[PDB]
Design an enzyme around this catalytic site. Structure first.
Site, PDB file in Angstrom:
ATOM      1  N   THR E   1       0.834  -1.249   0.000  1.00 36.54           N
ATOM      2  CA  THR E   1       0.000   0.000   0.000  1.00 36.54           C
ATOM      3  C   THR E   1       0.845   1.266   0.000  1.00 36.54           C
ATOM      4  O   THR E   1       1.928   1.319   0.605  1.00 36.54           O
ATOM      5  CB  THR E   1      -0.890   0.103   1.265  1.00 36.54           C
ATOM      6  OG1 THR E   1      -1.686  -1.085   1.413  1.00 36.54           O
ATOM      7  CG2 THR E   1      -1.783   1.347   1.185  1.00 36.54           C
ATOM      8  N   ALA E  49      -6.905  -2.527   7.181  1.00 32.75           N
ATOM      9  CA  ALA E  49      -8.228  -2.132   6.735  1.00 32.75           C
ATOM     10  C   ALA E  49      -9.306  -1.879   7.784  1.00 32.75           C
ATOM     11  O   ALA E  49      -9.656  -0.728   8.067  1.00 32.75           O
ATOM     12  CB  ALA E  49      -8.716  -3.137   5.754  1.00 32.75           C
TER      13      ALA E  49
END
Ligand code: MG
Ligand code: MG
Ligand code: MG
Ligand code: MG
Ligand code: MG
Ligand code: MG
EC number: 3.4.25.1
Lengths: 239, 198, 233, 240, 212, 241, 222, 244, 204
Positions: E1, E49
């Site tokens: 990410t 997340a």
């Protein structure tokens, strides 16, 4: 029908009412604001004077570098509130960095005075109070009054305690709603004379504490307060 | 670990503390003050576990300031450091200890003399002429043992310290990105902000 | 002139009566009227929604508790909601755990044992509301009469509320008929409707005043609101 | 005299008397210890034609071997039964062997006991009759609001207890060897009818249950069906 | 990410990728990594997340309560602090999450607080967190200046994130862009890395080594 | 709304419950404390008398609270001992925490706050005690403090509590020069004290004393709870047979 | 020691059609190298025109669904049978799921239905809570065999307009439900052929503005 | 006077303690609500002790959410409590369902709060002795039943209204409203309506200081009309009287 | 993985004819790195003495805890705590925390103001009492101390000699222990008077 946690036919909680009757029994406080200041005046029950001048207490109390408060009613009580407020003042700053909003503060205080009027087996604080100060990074003077029941209210200038009714009247036709007392000097001049009704001569019964923005603060000295009694009796004689 | 120094001199105390912040690999901020003034004349530098550090400091800070307006009288460096040690003493046997080491510099106004207290996370306190937590001592302690004199001026101290730094740079593996220096004295606190151009 | 035996729900009168509980039944007689009546294919609740003012809504008195169960109430809204609410859980407990649809006899049991507690302990007061319950389990149709006194009785039909009498009688008579109305819903209702209109005095029932509920052999509990009941007037 | 805990100037708890006073006021219940096992019966009072018959049962079983009935305050009765139900089932899980009727009573007596000790609680408003079997025979007792109970050859409370009492008296002497399991029922059926003659203008529905190693087979079963009918008719003839 | 945010003459710039990944296989390229806390605030998404997503919404609630009480806009510093305090409550439990909380208040001016699962609260002018944080800090360091054309700031962000996307296998997909001002945030759409790349290499002339 | 309960408020904001206790004091032995620019004095007259009672390997009026602080009781014996105990504890927590001696002002305050506590909750009655606090801390030097059951404390120049403390009070107002060295006070003490007595005359046995003093030769503070002897003697020095 | 978790294979699938939605997922159930039941439904209607399925560990799965179907019921009780907008359901699930954060539900869950405009909508879930509005997601064992395919077929990924050189990507177009189900069946067969944990049968729930339809098609009992 | 102790039942089966609390709300200054298919209005009489109190200090009308406003009457301390529970109840819901709460569903929660007070507890702990000395005028808009207006009564019950007024001159208005209200009332109409019944059964000369006025719509949400809008609106009012 | 062995330090005491003695080093440092040379392990509560070795914070905490309690004792009992009494106490105290033990090694010693009898004791971290009539040793170089003491203790020394013996005992064992040193201090307890002395030693 008086032992309240119950209702009068007309929907009263007489205890909560009576409690207010004690704030009147007590000493007297008065606050005023300008467009830069907020002064807090109080009287001094100079009655059994054979006690060290030095360390014995005085009405105005700092709660945080930028905020202070005063009261009238039971000293015995008052102290405990001040403490619990001071504590919440930090608990905030800790868990939020940002230092407290004067409105918030009061709401907390009023929440406590409010807590002591619900559970049976507790009694209301016989204390009504004036809280003044300037919000963080803000230049708008704030004045609030809280009282025993749990109500908080913002005033342009207000007074509590014995003979509040009087001085209140006085203030009413002096304080201009349209424009507030500009200069600090005269904003004080005002409050001082407003207390001269009940005082009965002597700046020896008059406490003044002054608060400006950016956490400045400063109590007054006796002569300073005297140089005002002076410059006022003068214009009174001049009328 | 990071860098935390401190040295007590004539009528003041000096605190050094590296500026960098690291997250495994990259270096985020590199202009970070590991300081927190507790009261007008007391101050505390610190280094320790990532979260444990900044929380504890502020928390200690809170209590003090509280005490100081409540009483209206300020608290003494001696007593301050005593309380900090108290809190860590418990902390160590708590369900989760705040892993943090500290240096506390203050000017005791009654004695009109400067005091400096070093304290590790285990709750280990000691008044010292100078100190440094972690590996920081190894590289420097000698130079201090050498040149240090109790009578040194505020300036004398800076020079010394400055030398200690030059060394830490020369033989330390890590890049600490420099140092922020600060002085506590009868006048209060001020920052030697100049240590960039100096 | 005097009466000391009516202090708490906790004290007995010299004879063996609980005035407090007796009073709760009086507030039951004070609320609006409502009716229930069963057969072998369905069960019906009919109630008179009463409004406060003329610029206000009519306070509803029917509640669902599961696809197969419900009730009407005469009295205090709050009290009722609680009871019905507790009831709702009880069915859910059964469904999830055992995966069986709650039997009415048993539903009354629980509402007895529940309201019971308030008659034996100091501090509280008893429930100010009565309920007519309806449902359709494996023993076919059923209908219940519940009092704050914790007495739940299994009936064939009934009414509670102010001027509840006139319907109780209409019912008492037209019994032999309706107990035999199986396979036809609209019939049971019109019947029930007549039984109730047999108790009005202020005036006749309108689309706003009326409310009906039903449940049966293939008719999961459903309610009819306002203009939906239009036909039955 | 107004609180539950207190004593009168010469040691008396009034709240309990009134408790008793309410127990009498309600319907009448009975029970009889016979050959082996017991037989109970109560008085459901049909107040209207809108009551489904064979429905609102006032008699309740405990475990799978204890009959039980009462009268006075109906919800109080129901409540008490629950506690008895736990105690039983807990014991059972613990000692494995189904609970001895002798002790059972105490477990309950002890619970009814308490509600005479504190002022914050209300005395139990019901007299309770019950029994069952085990290894060393069948037993039958009767618990009152005071919590004091005992073993009887047959019991009775509620409205007309004397009717059934003097009625129970007779049986003792003519059958001083325990009445027949069978005849026990039909006899009970009668003893009720006779005692009902107060609610005479108001019709009623009689409910009966029993226990017996020979008839029920150690268990407690609801006397309903065929034996139930004749037992009524049996009463219906002597009803003259 | 690869997420990042930075402060400048015009306010704040936030940029993200969108590639979620379980082991070696790509689970999704349609990831929203910018949590629209509320009209005036944003949180990025590093770590894990659910943790970011959940708590940051929780936080969004927390603001509404404060604001309504005070009849005033909640200040970034506080908001961030709160999250931190909440996160600290769980230090040890296994909460994992990196994140920038960005806002622009009446007084505070533009302001970024990087915050993590370890209770690190950090004021800053530039932050990159993730796998690609390393490559992104490249482009940024060299090319940053405080007076960027509002549009250039938006371009820098793109390109930066883009470098990371190319190299860092665990990063990529499409870039999301938001700009922040005194009156709230504004979305600047989605850009498929696939398409974009080809564009940049073209216009910018950069990415020579690459064939075709 | 009349008398009963502390949680009650009379129609005029009075807490009778308190006002009785706050007055119950007028039943205890006359205790006095005086300030001097060199030492503090605590004088007290014993009560509960007969002829078969010891008092030497004990006391019940003058209790040492800290090596730097002392108090004079005047209320319920049972009460006092409880506060006296928790007052000692807390004082030590201050020491154990800040590693320093606890300031008098602070200590008095915390106590006044417990007394106040019992002044506002149902299920408990206020303490019926009054204290003359006497001590020193380097923050504000020597200090004489007082507190009633209403939970209010006060700074005094020289005060009395208990019996005839209106009479006894005024006697003080006369003779008192702010500097007034200690011996003149110790002396004054008795003068004030004698004058206010139901005993035919002042006998040592029925009497309690103590003083506080500090200096350059001590460098620190020393306090003395006077033993049976010293008293029987200084009494004579003030001209008493 | 005791291992509180387990895997029962399974593969589910959700596609968000323009104005419909499908939630398909096979009927096999496994343990190690054995079989449990040739037929065992993992996809359900929960009312309010909303389908659900949670694949991974049966027990945690069906418990979630059960725990949810109840939380729907209760929503009606407190808000007068207001319908649950799909978006809402998901925010709700997040919580349920997150309730057991430090002892999660070992499952990938998915739901599908319609939004407050009539557009189809799918929602993919994390095993602890992160939800995304997906328009197409395959989860389960076979996952990595089908996702690449839909990528291509459904979004025409890597497909350009001939003769444009490679400058014009083939435009997306929305396919009727028939068209979708054809894709879906093919996806599963292919998957069954090369995946042992997958085979037997396929049960599909189709959501539309008037209910839920169910259609079944048998797979290979490989 | 026997029969006045909270959980005590009158022999006619009635609870006075409750009934008196209602008598509290009476003492509050007047508040009026009007629901029009166009939007919903909330207006209240202020009544200030002195000219030194800063009017805006009296929070008689407050925002509960972008979509729900409120006006209270009676005990101000008690208000703050209900207002806070409500404000919380709202946000909480939004966190759980990502939507807006049904005005009545909200209202419900508040009434659920009210009647939740015990006297030693015959089962359920309820920490708070007596009932609330305040009522509410909840007024919002959900997209299921559009514009809505409600009356919160301490008894734990409530009703839906087209127009309702609580406070001092309750009937003085309710009578008036009873025959002024009609569906096709526009919003502008409604304002000048509330503004009239206040002035009438009000006490002093009507002006922005003694009267706060607000409203809420699907469009913008709950907005509290500043002193300008109110001031002029007074004119459009005091002018039409002259004629008829 | 031993705590006691992290900070360093030792303490030893002996009983003479009509008096006692107790000395300790001065060093304090985290393992290798020496930190202080002004850290004392011996204090007192009126006329009672306590030497504590082991883990530094735990040492400090203990002193505080004891000063605290002795103050509170002497107060309600109008008399200072006695040796034998103190022992039994510090004993129990250590145990109250028997499952979160304090990593230390105390040693008490003094003169009973009534009998006039010299006293010495030693304990393990949980409060086990070691009553001895010659000497007590605790700390890093425990073993080196027993080697000295066993040779040097002579029943009943004159205070002026006892000093010289204990001094040498401590002093020498300290040099074969790498974790103790940097100065030392010895007290000599007589019925009345008490003499504190710091001695010169290797500073390595
Ligand atoms: Mg009792
Ligand atoms: Mg890559
Ligand atoms: Mg929705
Ligand atoms: Mg096979
Ligand atoms: Mg050793
Ligand atoms: Mg050595």
């Amino acid at each position: 029908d008086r032992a309240l946690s119950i209702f009068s036919p007309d929907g009263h909680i007489f205890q909560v009412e009576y409690a207010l009757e004690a704030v009147k029994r007590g000493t007297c406080a008065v606050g005023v604001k300008g467009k830069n200041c907020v002064v807090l005046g109080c009287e001094r029950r100079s009655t059994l004077k054979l006690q060290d001048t030095r360390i014995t207490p005085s009405k105005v109390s700092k709660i945080d570098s930028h905020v202070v408060l005063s009261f009238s009613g039971l000293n015995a009580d008052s102290r405990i509130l001040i403490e619990k407020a001071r504590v919440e003042a930090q608990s905030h700053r800790l868990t939020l960095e940002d230092p407290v909003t004067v409105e918030y503060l009061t709401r907390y205080v009023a929440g406590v005075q409010q807590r002591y009027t619900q559970s049976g087996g507790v009694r209301p604080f016989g204390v009504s109070t004036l809280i003044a100060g300037f919000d963080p990074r803000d230049d708008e003077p704030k004045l609030y009054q809280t009282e025993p029941s749990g109500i908080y209210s913002s005033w342009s200038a207000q007074t509590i305690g014995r003979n509040s009714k009087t001085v209140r009247e006085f203030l009413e036709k002096n304080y201009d709603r349209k424009e507030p007392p500009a200069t600090v000097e005269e904003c004080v001049k005002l409050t001082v004379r407003s207390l001269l009704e009940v005082v009965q001569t002597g700046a020896k019964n008059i406490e003044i504490t002054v608060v400006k923005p950016d956490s400045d603060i400063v109590a007054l000295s006796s002569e300073e307060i005297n140089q005002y009694v002076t410059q006022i009796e003068q214009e009174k004689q001049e009328q | 670990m990071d860098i935390i120094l401190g040295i007590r001199v004539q009528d003041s105390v000096i605190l050094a503390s590296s500026k960098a912040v690291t997250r495994g690999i990259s270096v985020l901020k590199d202009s970070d003050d590991k300081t927190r003034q507790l009261s007008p004349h007391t101050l505390m530098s610190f280094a320790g576990e990532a979260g444990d550090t900044v929380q504890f400091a502020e928390y200690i800070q809170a209590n003090i300031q509280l005490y100081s307006i409540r009483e209206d009288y300020e608290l003494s460096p001696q007593a301050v450091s005593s309380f900090v040690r108290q809190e860590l003493a418990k902390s160590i046997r708590s369900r989760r200890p705040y892993q943090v080491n500290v240096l506390i510099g203050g000017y005791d106004k009654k004695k009109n003399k400067p005091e400096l207290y070093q304290i590790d996370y285990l709750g280990t306190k000691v008044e010292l002429p100078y100190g440094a937590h972690g590996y920081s001592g190894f590289y420097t302690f000698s130079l201090l043992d050498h040149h240090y004199r109790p009578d040194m001026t505020t300036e004398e101290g800076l020079d010394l310290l400055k030398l200690c730094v030059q060394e830490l740079e020369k033989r330390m593996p890590m890049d600490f990105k420099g140092v922020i220096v600060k002085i506590v004295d009868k006048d209060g606190i001020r920052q030697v902000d100049d240590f960039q151009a100096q | 002139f005097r009466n000391n035996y009516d202090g708490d729900t906790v004290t007995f009168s010299p004879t063996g009566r609980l005035f407090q509980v007796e009073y709760a039944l009086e507030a039951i007689k004070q609320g609006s009227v409502t009716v229930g009546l069963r057969s072998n294919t369905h069960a019906v609740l009919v109630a008179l929604k009463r409004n406060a003012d003329e610029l206000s809504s009519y306070q509803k008195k029917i509640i669902k508790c599961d696809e197969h169960m419900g009730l009407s109430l005469a009295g205090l809204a709050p009290d009722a909601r609680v009871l019905s609410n507790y009831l709702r859980q009880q069915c859910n407990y059964s469904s999830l755990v055992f995966n069986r649809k709650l039997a009415v006899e048993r539903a009354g049991h629980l509402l007895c044992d529940k309201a019971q507690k308030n008659t034996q302990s100091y501090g509280g007061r008893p429930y100010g509301v009565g309920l007519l319950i309806i449902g359709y389990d494996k023993s076919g149709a059923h209908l219940l009469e519940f009092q704050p006194s914790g007495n739940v009785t299994e009936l064939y039909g009934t009414a509670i509320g102010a001027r509840s009498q006139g319907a109780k009688t209409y019912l008492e008579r037209t019994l032999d008929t309706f107990i035999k109305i199986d396979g036809n819903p609209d019939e049971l209702i019109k019947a029930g409707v007549e039984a109730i209109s047999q108790s009005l005095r202020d005036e006749s029932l309108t689309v706003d005043n009326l409310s009906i509920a039903i449940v049966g052999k293939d008719t999961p509990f459903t309610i009819y609101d306002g203009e939906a009941v239009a036909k039955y007037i | 005299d107004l609180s539950n805990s207190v004593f009168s100037p010469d040691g008396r708890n009034f709240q309990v008397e009134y408790a008793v006073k309410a127990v009498e006021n309600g319907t009448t219940s009975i029970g009889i210890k016979c050959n082996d096992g017991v037989v109970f019966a109560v008085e459901k009072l049909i107040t209207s034609k809108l009551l489904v018959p064979q429905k609102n049962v006032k008699i309740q079983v405990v475990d799978r071997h204890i009959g039980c009935v009462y009268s006075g305050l109906i919800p109080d009765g129901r409540h008490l039964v629950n506690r008895g139900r736990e105690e039983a089932a807990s014991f059972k899980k613990l000692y494995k062997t189904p609970i001895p009727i002798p002790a059972f009573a105490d477990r309950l007596g002890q619970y009814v006991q308490a509600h005479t000790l504190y002022n914050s609680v209300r005395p139990f408003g019901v007299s309770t009759i019950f029994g069952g079997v085990d290894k060393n025979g069948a037993h039958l007792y009767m618990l009152e609001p005071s919590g004091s109970y005992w073993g009887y050859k047959g019991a009775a409370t509620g409205k007309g207890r004397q009717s059934a009492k003097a009625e129970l008296e007779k049986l003792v002497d003519h059958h001083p060897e325990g009445l027949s399991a069978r005849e026990a029922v039909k006899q009970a059926a009668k003893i009720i009818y006779l005692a009902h003659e107060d609610n005479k203008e108001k019709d009623f529905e009689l409910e009966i249950s029993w226990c017996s190693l020979s008839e029920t087979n150690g268990l407690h079963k609801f006397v309903k069906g065929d034996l139930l009918q004749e037992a009524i008719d049996f009463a219906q003839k002597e009803i003259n | 990410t690869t997420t990042l945010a930075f402060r400048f003459q015009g306010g704040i710039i936030v940029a993200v990728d969108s590639r979620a990944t379980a082991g070696n296989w790509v689970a999704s390229q349609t990831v929203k990594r910018v949590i629209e806390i509320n009209p005036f605030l944003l949180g990025t998404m590093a770590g894990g997340a659910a943790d970011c997503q959940f708590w940051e919404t929780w936080l969004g609630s927390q603001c509404r309560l404060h604001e309504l009480r005070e009849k005033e806009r909640i200040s970034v510093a506080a908001a961030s602090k709160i999250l931190s305090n909440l996160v600290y409550q769980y230090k040890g439990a296994g909460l994992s999450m990196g994140t920038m909380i960005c806002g622009y208040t009446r007084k505070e001016g533009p302001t970024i607080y990087y915050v993590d699962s370890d209770g690190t609260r950090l004021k800053g002018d530039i932050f990159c967190v993730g796998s690609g944080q390393t490559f992104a800090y490249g482009v940024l360091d060299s090319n940053y200046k405080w007076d960027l054309s509002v549009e250039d700031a938006l371009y820098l962000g793109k390109r930066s994130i883009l470098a990371a996307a190319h190299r860092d296998a665990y990063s990529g997909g499409s870039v999301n862009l938001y700009h922040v001002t005194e009156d709230g945030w504004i979305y600047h759409g989605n850009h498929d890395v696939g398409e974009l790349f080809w564009k940049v290499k073209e216009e910018e002339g950069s990415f020579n080594n690459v064939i075709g | 709304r009349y008398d009963s309960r502390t949680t009650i408020f009379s129609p005029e904001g009075r807490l009778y419950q308190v006002e009785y206790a706050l007055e119950s004091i007028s039943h205890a032995g006359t205790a006095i404390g005086i300030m001097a620019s060199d030492g503090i004095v605590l004088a007290a007259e014993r009560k509960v008398t007969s002829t078969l009672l010891e008092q030497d390997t004990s006391t019940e009026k003058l209790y040492k609270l800290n090596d730097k602080i002392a108090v004079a009781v005047a209320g319920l014996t049972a009460d006092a001992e409880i506060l006296i105990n928790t007052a000692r504890i807390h004082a030590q927590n201050y020491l154990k925490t800040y590693n320093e001696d606890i300031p008098v002002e602070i200590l008095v305050r915390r106590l006044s706050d417990i007394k106040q506590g019992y002044t506002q909750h149902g299920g408990l009655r206020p303490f019926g005690v009054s204290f003359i606090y006497a001590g020193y801390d380097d923050r504000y030097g020597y200090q004489l403090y007082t507190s009633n059951p209403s939970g209010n404390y006060t700074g005094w120049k020289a005060i009395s509590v208990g019996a005839n403390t209106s009479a006894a009070q005024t006697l003080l107002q006369m003779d008192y020069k702010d500097d007034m060295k200690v011996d003149d006070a110790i002396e004054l003490a008795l003068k004030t004290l004698s004058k206010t007595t139901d005993s035919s005359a002042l006998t040592y046995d029925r009497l309690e004393f103590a003083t506080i003093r500090k200096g350059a030769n001590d460098g620190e503070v020393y306090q003395k709870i006077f033993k049976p002897q010293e008293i029987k003697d200084i009494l004579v020095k003030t001209g008493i047979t | 020691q005791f291992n509180p978790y387990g895997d029962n294979g399974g593969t589910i699938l959700g596609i968000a059609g323009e104005d419909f939605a499908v939630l398909a997922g096979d009927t096999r159930n496994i343990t190690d190298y054995s079989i449990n039941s040739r037929y065992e439904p993992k996809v359900f209607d929960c009312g309010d025109n909303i389908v659900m399925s949670a694949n991974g560990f049966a027990a945690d799965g069906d418990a979630l669904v059960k725990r949810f179907k109840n939380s729907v019921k209760w929503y009606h009780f407190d808000h007068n049978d207001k319908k649950l907008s799909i978006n809402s359901a998901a925010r709700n699930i997040q919580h349920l799921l997150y309730g057991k954060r430090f002892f999660p539900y070992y499952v990938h869950t998915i739901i599908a239905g319609l939004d407050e405009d009539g557009k189809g909508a799918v929602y993919s879930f994390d095993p602890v809570g992160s939800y995304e509005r997906e328009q197409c997601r395959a989860g389960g064992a076979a996952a990595s065999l089908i996702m690449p395919f839909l990528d291509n077929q459904v979004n025409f990924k890597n497909q350009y307009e001939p003769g444009t050189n490679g400058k014009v990507k083939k435009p997306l177009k929305y396919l009727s439900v028939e068209e979708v189900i054809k894709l879906v069946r093919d996806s599963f067969t292919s998957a069954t052929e090369r995946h042992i944990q997958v085979g037997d049968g396929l049960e599909i729930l189709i959501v539309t503005k008037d209910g839920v339809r169910k259609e079944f098609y048998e797979l290979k009992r490989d | 006077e026997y029969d006045r102790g909270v959980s005590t039942f009158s022999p006619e089966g009635r609870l006075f303690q409750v009934e008196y609390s209602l008598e509290a709300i009476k003492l509050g200054s007047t508040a009026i609500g009007i629901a029009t298919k166009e939007g919903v209005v909330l207006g209240v009489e202020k009544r200030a002790t002195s000219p030194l109190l800063e009017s805006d200090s009296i929070e008689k009308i407050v925002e509960i959410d972008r979509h729900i406003g409120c006006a209270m009457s009676g005990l101000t301390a008690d208000a703050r409590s209900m207002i806070e529970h409500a404000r919380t109840a709202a946000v909480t819901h939004n966190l759980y369902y990502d939507e807006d709460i049904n005005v009545e569903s909200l209202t419900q929660s508040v009434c659920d709060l009210a009647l939740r007070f015990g006297e030693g507890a015959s089962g359920e702990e309820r920490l708070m002795s007596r009932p609330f000395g305040v009522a509410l005028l909840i007024a919002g808009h959900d997209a299921d039943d559009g514009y809505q207006l409600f009356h919160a009564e301490p008894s734990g019950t409530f009703y839906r209204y087209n127009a309702k007024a609580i406070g001092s001159g309750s009937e003085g208005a309710q009578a008036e409203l009873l025959n002024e209200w009609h569906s096709s009332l526009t919003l502008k109409e409604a304002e000048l309506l509330v503004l009239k019944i206040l002035k009438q059964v009000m006490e002093e000369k009507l002006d922005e200081n003694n009267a706060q006025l607000s409203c809420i719509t699907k469009q913008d949400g709950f907005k509290i009309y500043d002193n300008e809008k109110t001031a002029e609106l007074i004119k459009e009012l005091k002018e039409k009287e002259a004629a008829e | 993985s031993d705590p006691s062995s992290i900070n360093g330090g030792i303490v030893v005491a002996m009983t003479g004819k009509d008096c006692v003695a107790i000395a300790c080093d001065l060093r304090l440092g985290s393992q290798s790195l020496g930190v202080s040379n002004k850290f004392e392990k011996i204090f007192h509560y009126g006329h009672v003495f306590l030497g504590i070795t082991g883990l530094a914070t735990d040492v400090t905490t203990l002193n505080e805890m004891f000063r605290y309690k002795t103050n509170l004792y002497k107060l309600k009992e109008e008399r200072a705590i006695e040796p034998e009494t103190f022992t039994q106490l510090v004993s129990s105290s250590l145990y109250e925390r028997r499952f979160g033990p304090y990593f230390v090694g105390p040693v008490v010693a003094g003169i009973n103001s009534k009998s006039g009898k010299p006293f010495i004791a030693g304990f393990d971290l949980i409060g086990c009492i070691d009553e001895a009539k010659d000497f007590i040793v605790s700390g890093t170089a425990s073993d080196q101390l027993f080697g000295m003491c066993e040779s040097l203790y002579e029943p009943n020394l004159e205070p002026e000699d006892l000093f010289e013996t204990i001094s040498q005992a401590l002093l020498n064992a300290a040099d074969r222990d790498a974790l103790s040193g940097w100065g030392a201090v010895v007290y000599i307890i007589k019925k009345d008077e008490v003499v504190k002395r710091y001695l010169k030693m290797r500073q390595d």
